[PDB]
Amino acid sequence: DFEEIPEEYL
Amino acid sequence: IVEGSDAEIGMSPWQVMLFRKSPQELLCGASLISDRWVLTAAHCLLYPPWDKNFTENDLLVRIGKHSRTRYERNIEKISMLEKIYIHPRYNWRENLDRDIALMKLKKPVAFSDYIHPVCLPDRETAASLLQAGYKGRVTGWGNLKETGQPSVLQVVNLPIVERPVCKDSTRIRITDNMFCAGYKPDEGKRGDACEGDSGGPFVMKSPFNNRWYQMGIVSWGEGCDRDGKYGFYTHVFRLKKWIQKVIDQFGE
Amino acid sequence: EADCGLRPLFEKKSLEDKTERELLESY
Ligand SMILES: Cc1nc2ccccc2n1Cc1ccc2c(c1)nc(CNc1ccc(C(=N)N)cc1)n2C
DSSP, rough: OOOOOGGOOO | BOOOOOOTTTTTTTEEEEEEETTTTTEEEEEEESSSSSEOGGGTEEEEGGGOOOOOGGGGEEEEBBBSSSOOOTTEEEEEEEEEEEEETTTTTTOTTTOOEEEEEESOOOOSSSOOOBEEEEHHEEEEEOOTEEEEEEESSSHHHHHHHHOOOEEEEEEEEOHHHTTTOOSSSOTTEEEEEOOGGOOOOBBOOOTTTTOEEEEEOOOTTOOOOEEEEEEEEEEETTTTTTTEETTTTHHHHHHHHHHHHHOO | SSSSSOTTTTTTGOOOOOHHHHHHTTO
């Protein structure tokens, strides 16, 4: 249930 | 953290969340010791019994957080790992001895009101504070009960326990590289770290210079907040020499 | 670290958090 983090970090 | 309470904003600016990319999830707690060095428990990265053996690219470090699941825009900073260093003598085979690991971030993190490093203890600081009865502070986003998850970083202050008491509370072999903390059944009070808290910091505020020092790393425990049981912590100062050498050998 | 252990929202502005006194009273 973790909010999406900026795709820039993945 | 069992029986703790909501952290105040900016109360633990060195608090770091070890985050798994796929799936996206809380892996462990950790701490900020400089702009590029994060300290945690070796077991958070390497632990064969639980098929755990992460590599840099599998992880993400989330700094400056308060909320557990929410991406805190403009507050938290997410860093990537350049390299992971685990104590060469970390023993996961018998008892999690020397349960400590360092992670070098790809590039320095910027300090703010929510991001700031904790001090590592010197011999004198450790000697004076690492005494039975003296209280330390544990923080994390782990479970609130042994058997839910908090919305915000939890905090609990717990007393250091006499080594004999620590040893007599379990059948596990305690080493000098560990120390235990928590209340005794007759002390009334309670609280303890729990699943999701490991790798996190156990800090103490020095009354000599008013600075916070990380004395322990949430290492292991039997259950969570069980009467007669105590949380065990990696004795940070005892393994500081390793820390020193790694930081000035591969660090910045 | 030269400024380590001093929190921006507390030590830096001479404000104490809600439970630190408990720690110092046990020393
Ligand atoms: C079965 C056994 N043989 C042992 C030998 C030495 C130390 C622990 C041992 N254990 C239990 C054990 C082993 C490994 C463990 C563990 C508990 N707990 C963790 C990490 N999580 C964790 C869970 C609870 C608490 C706590 N309540 N304070 C602190 C940490 N690891 C990574």
